[PDB]
Design a protein around this nucleic acid. Structure first.
Ligand SMILES: Nc1ncnc2c1ncn2[C@@H]1O[C@H](COP(=O)(O)OP(=O)(O)O)[C@@H](O)[C@H]1O
Ligand SMILES: [Mg+2]
Lengths: 788, 754
DNA sequence: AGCTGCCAGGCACCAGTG
DNA sequence: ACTGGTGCGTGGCAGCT
């Protein structure tokens, strides 16, 4: 096993190892001329993941070196295979110039691709956020922080406990999570994609204040509302140190951070988010969710924004009224605005690629195209009487200048890259038209020299061509070549031709090639100059992008209210919900039969409904529809009902039924307040008959009598219908069933009162439990009903 | 590409891989389907590299999709149930074609394994045993009749194939099948009066033959599977016992994972088949028993030799289809070289079955010797390029190779001659398709090329040339090589000629080797893991002393606690109270698996097991609705020979209704049915059942409060449970002191009256 | 239209002339 | 020390069919 000290290595392997040791945990692509290459175990892994050959590399002393690699022009394809598997790559490039370089040319890692810091169009999902998060734990709480690199959205929060932290990880769903080496509660995080253990020094607070002030160009973070917040700042510090280290360029689009407080949003727990199928259904897919229904936005950025609001309802009455207003003002204007807004596309990600300086030609094209829709959007929106719509008309901006620049700079449909030129347009730079001018002897000159030399020699097989390896030539067939001028110089031989070079062609080769390299460089100077001219207006460009996404959202929720018959919610001071004719938004589109609308009435005097009714009677659904109506109302949307009054809701809790059920329930009892909506679905599990019910009863009583929260409480325990009798705030409601003949009818109708009876025997009969057994069950029931 | 849609008329219901360069390209609506099933992208194009077609065909084919290749006209069709290439199968898993069919009377069913020739039919009467047969056999491809009524059974299955009604005609069926097997009638196969099943098998065989476009000389038999030959296990039971597959779709923490230490892939597949089809006939069981005990001693000697034998079943398939590539032959040779050693080790085992497996096994010495002399030690994957046939097998071939080598030797020396005659140290001789051989000088030295050298190609740093002498010897090499390659192929096709007449005996060998793999494994497993030989009794009853869950005991690193079990007709039902937390559930399932293992012929995880005849095994251990429907199936279909295992029915409905259904169920199962039953319940009110009816007793699990925890004991005790622990766990989970207090009052109040 | 085989641009290696 | 040949991934495409 070779001892491999520094001197045992070649100049190349020495250099490769310094850089490898900057990032020992992750794959390193190492630029060698036209190939990106990997070595040692990296090569063996790449070989297994990227389906390429594992080969070797000769060595004057000792062991051979395992090696794999791909040509430079295929990189993006392979990076996609790797980031789709949760893998990071450090990309190493050549900085220097081999000709002014005795040893190996100089080499830096210029970039690291990681699942959380990708900004390229090919490696992302259009309609779905891809966040980088940092997390860390204290002796009292959590610090958490998300950055979305391809928009600059930088956020900070300090969840108070395990279950709020869990709910946050579920909500943000980071593609990559940096977490501190001493994180205690690993069960929040174990089994998460993109997990990245970090050293504790990256979470040091004085360094975080330093990075973030530096970054934001401030002295303190008071203006951002986070000087207050050292737990969170330490995740933000780690997160930004990383973003920086993966990008290794400045990041002008990350110009701010905001704190997400408990009190600004309704905080749904983890069960709640799952039970309501907000963007992922219970089997993991995106069919039959809230979002499948509501989301008909016409730009990717507008669909992501919608999904964030759905997930994070604001509590701010002002903001909510504003959004509701906008939705009603724009009812009519949707069919005109939507086709036009669709042509804005994903402006937000393009400006991100603009700030990272990675934007390609078609990115500037689509940006130019976006600016071209701004006038038509301005004209439509002028007529809409709504101060909120006008603020969003105003934030949208116009950018006449920058539009006119991209029309005079890029051609109508440029190629995918700038590497191959043919991107910058005519008239933009008069030195460039002049450099193409000279490299337009390709048309005229060559055909003329050809026909001239064909006529002159009388050699009819004579052609003129170009070949990358040997340059220009004059071909002559093998059978005519013994007849060519003595002047003609052998350049390249072939099985049945002989190609030649004379001084007039080689002169024309020296000027085509060199004028073409001069013209390409210039084009790249000019194309990177588009960034210098576009970038100073970046602030307003991001505000334009966000304006347009918000518009896309509100216009969408305006169309959805109209189409699916939703009305405006009103807000009240105290806790309570009053629905007239509410429907479950999702279930009312999938069902082929018609949806039975039911009411609800929660107040402080009527703050807990014990809900009976048969299995399949519609109990769960009535509970979910309450939470979704409350949810849509607190994103500012119209709501699926004839009428809705609703008061302030701080937090929604769900428990849907061993230890986990009890623990979940403890948390409901410790953190629920009079402002929470609590959904308990068929809880209280014991080991003997009355064990678990005793527990639900005690729990219910705590919710009614001590916590006084708003509680929908579905049960099959008929014994809990005796709760109202005994408890202030508690009422019985029930889902009507109908036992005509021998079968059962599920009315999905909510009535007031306890049910006339439970229906368990009936459901069993339905499932084909033999008649003879149902007969005896009915006998014992009658026995049990005589105790009381 | 207007000659694409024309070809998708030819075969429309099949994905159409279309040659486009170094790629196969799917277009309109095959491409939609293809980018969703394989994670690759679309533009309506889709694409895959040529180097990975078998790698992308194996995915599509194990999601129930046929694929048609195109190179132009459709040159190849692979279907899921008909593949036999080793790159396209999973090494340790059966892959079946199946046909299904219905009658006024009932169902017909057939299954083929195209690689082993294992052909089987059956005639399930009710639909639930038809469902049962579909989960067990789990075809990769399902042929069903057009005007088939009960689509509910086969609706969600992958690999469905709608078929004309005439493909199920009984007279076509009998006549095909008899033609396939060389018989006038099917009486020697035991299926002549099995028309429902025959129709299914007549379709199946038709399809097989059509997909192959060959003889299938290896399918020479069919067998009826009968209801009474087997312990019937519904899908739900099969799934809850985690036999091959775990409740969470994986292959671990399963019975087959603990017990499957077979050494050959064909022996692993056979074991899994026994594990899903326990037999009622104790004769076959006493025999497997007797064999495992006979071999406990010879196991260490046998398994490394058998491991070497590999997959002789699937190689023989490829021998019968005539597709067996040189390594398939090289590894059949290796298998043969183990038979004499295998025969020596088994010589002394004093059981008549091991000696029958030893005769059946065979030796085939002169076939061993034929391939020792025919093929080289490590031949290439394909015959295509030769270097497979051995030095000294055939006179002509060595002659043609010696002429090639002497032409190729000349040319290595032509290089040293030209280079010593010119003084040009960069001169060499190479070969490619464009030029044949050529002298190559480098660019810097090429201006001193002899004037007799004719230039044919200029590279960037070299020039290449030909001379007459170079082209003359190119002729000698290429004609020789070509003749020796044509001959290699002819010689290799002649191995198929000489091997195939013994195909029957070879299949009997692979089969016998498979069983031996299984029994040698079941025997190592019994010994290693302290199992015991179960005795069988006449009337029903299970009696276990210190028995264990075979899987939980290897997986969980905690002390497994063993438990007794006494069921007879005077003690048919145990009401099981106390905590569950899987303790009850492990206890119940372990009864099922000990019974299951008894009835494949294996040893079992206990110190003693006596067990009576069992016709079915029901295990409702796992909505309220599904629980009632599974329970309803138990009550409609259980007999006094069934083992029934119920987990706490009544949960998820009112106390009284669910107590009422529990009670009534247990009555039924104990009085009417009289099945052997473990009825786990939470209802303490059911513990008054032994007092009211004969045959019922009370067992329970207890638990132990200590330090700052609870200890759920794993131990079954007589009598009803004295305690509940819902509240105890509640306390330990953080539920406020005072909520717990209130709950404790209410509990006393509710139980109080009872 | 297909199939085979040069080439890319780094670096190190290696066998032959100081 | 130089000099001039060698080898090393995958993919693009010239140069033959
Ligand atoms: N109000 C309604 N109108 C029409 N169908 C309904 C309604 N409520 C429920 N359903 C139907 O009944 C089914 C059962 O709903 P669920 O709330 O789960 O019943 P439960 O929870 O009482 O067992 C749902 O899948 C839905 O299709
Ligand atoms: Mg429910």
């Amino acid at each position: 096993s070779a001892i491999e000290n520094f001197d045992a290595h070649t100049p190349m392997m020495q250099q490769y190892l310094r850089l490898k040791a900057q990032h020992p945990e992750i794959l390193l692509f190492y630029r060698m001329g036209d190939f990106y290459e990997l070595f040692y175990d990296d090569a063996k892994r790449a070989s297994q993941l990227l389906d390429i050959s594992l080969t070797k590399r000769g060595a004057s002393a000792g062991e051979p070196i395992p090696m794999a690699g791909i040509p430079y022009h295929a990189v993006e394809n392979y990076l996609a295979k790797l980031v789709n598997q949760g893998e990071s790559v450090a990309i190493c490039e050549q900085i220097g110039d081999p000709a002014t370089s005795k040893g190996p040319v100089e080499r830096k890692v210029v970039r690291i691709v990681t699942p959380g810091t990708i900004s390229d169009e090919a490696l992302l999902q259009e309609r779905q956020d891809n966040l980088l998060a940092a997390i860390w734990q204290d002796s009292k709480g959590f610090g958490y922080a998300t950055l979305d690199i391809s928009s600059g959205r930088f956020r900070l929060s300090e969840p108070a406990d395990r279950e709020t932290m869990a709910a946050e990880l579920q909500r943000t769903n980071p593609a990559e999570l940096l977490y501190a080496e001493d994180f205690a509660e690993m069960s929040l995080i174990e089994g998460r994609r993109g997990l990245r253990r970090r050293p504790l020094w990256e979470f040091e607070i004085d360094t975080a204040r330093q990075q973030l002030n530096l970054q934001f160009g401030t002295r303190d973070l008071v203006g951002f509302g986070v000087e207050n917040a050292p737990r969170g700042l330490c995740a933000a510090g780690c997160l930004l140190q990383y973003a920086k280290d993966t990008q290794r360029t400045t990041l002008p689009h990350i110009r701010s951070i905001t704190m997400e407080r408990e009190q600004d949003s309704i905080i749904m727990d983890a069960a709640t988010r799952r039970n309501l199928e907000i963007t992922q259904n219970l089997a993991g897919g995106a069919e039959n969710t809230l979002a499948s229904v509501l989301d008909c936005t016409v730009t990717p950025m507008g669909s992501r924004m919608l999904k964030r609001w759905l997930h994070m309802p604001v509590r701010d009455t002002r903001v909510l009224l504003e959004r509701q207003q906008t939705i009603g003002a724009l009812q009519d204007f949707t069919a005109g605005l939507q086709p036009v807004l669709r042509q804005v596309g994903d402006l937000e990600r393009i400006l991100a690629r603009l700030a990272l300086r990675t934007a390609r030609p078609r990115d500037l094209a689509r940006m130019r195209h976006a600016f071209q829709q701004l006038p038509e959007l301005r004209a439509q929106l002028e007529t809409v009487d709504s101060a909120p719509v006008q603020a969003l008309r105003e934030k949208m901006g116009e950018f006449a200048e920058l539009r006119d620049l991209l029309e005079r700079a890029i051609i109508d449909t440029p190629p995918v890259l700038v590497r191959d030129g043919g991107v910058i347009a005519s008239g933009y730079n008069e030195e460039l038209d002049e450099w193409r001018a000279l490299a337009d002897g390709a048309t005229d000159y060559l055909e003329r020299l050809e026909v001239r030399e064909r006529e002159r020699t009388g050699l009819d097989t004579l052609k003129v061509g170009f070949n990358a390896v040997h340059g220009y030539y004059i071909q002559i067939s093998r059978g005519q070549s013994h007849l060519a001028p003595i002047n003609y110089m052998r350049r390249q031989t072939l099985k049945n031709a002989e190609r030649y070079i004379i001084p007039e062609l080689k002169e024309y080769e020296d000027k085509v090639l060199t004028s073409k390299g001069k013209a390409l460089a210039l084009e790249k100077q000019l194309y990177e100059e588009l960034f210098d001219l576009l970038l100073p207006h970046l602030e307003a460009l991001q505000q334009s992008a966000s304006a347009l996404a918000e518009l896309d959202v509100l216009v969408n929720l305006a169309e959805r209210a109209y189409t699916l018959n939703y009305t405006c919610p009103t807000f009240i001071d105290k806790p309570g919900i009053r629905i007239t004719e509410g429907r479950h938004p999702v279930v009312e589109q999938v069902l082929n039969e018609p949806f039975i609308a039911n009411p609800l009435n929660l107040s402080p005097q009527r703050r807990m409904l014990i809900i009976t009714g048969p299995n399949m009677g519609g109990k769960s659904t009535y509970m979910r529809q309450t939470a979704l109506i409350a949810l849509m109302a607190y994103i500012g949307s119209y709501v699926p009902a004839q009428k809705v009054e609703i008061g302030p809701i701080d937090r929604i809790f769900t428990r849907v039924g061993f230890m986990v059920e009890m623990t979940e329930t403890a948390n409901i009892l410790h953190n629920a307040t009079e402002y929470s909506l609590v959904l308990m679905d068929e809880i209280g599990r014991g080991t003997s008959t009355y064990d678990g019910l005793s527990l639900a009863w005690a729990c219910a009583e705590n919710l009614a009598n001590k916590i006084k929260a708003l509680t929908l409480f579905a049960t099959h325990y008929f014994e809990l219908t005796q709760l109202p009798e005994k408890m202030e705030g508690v009422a019985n409601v029930h889902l009507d069933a109908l036992e005509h003949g021998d079968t059962i009818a599920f009315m999905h109708s909510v009535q007031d009162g306890a049910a006339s009876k439970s229906y368990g025997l009936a459901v069993a009969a339905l499932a084909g439990v033999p008649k003879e057994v149902i007969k005896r069950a009915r006998q014992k029931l009658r026995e049990l009903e005589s105790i009381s």
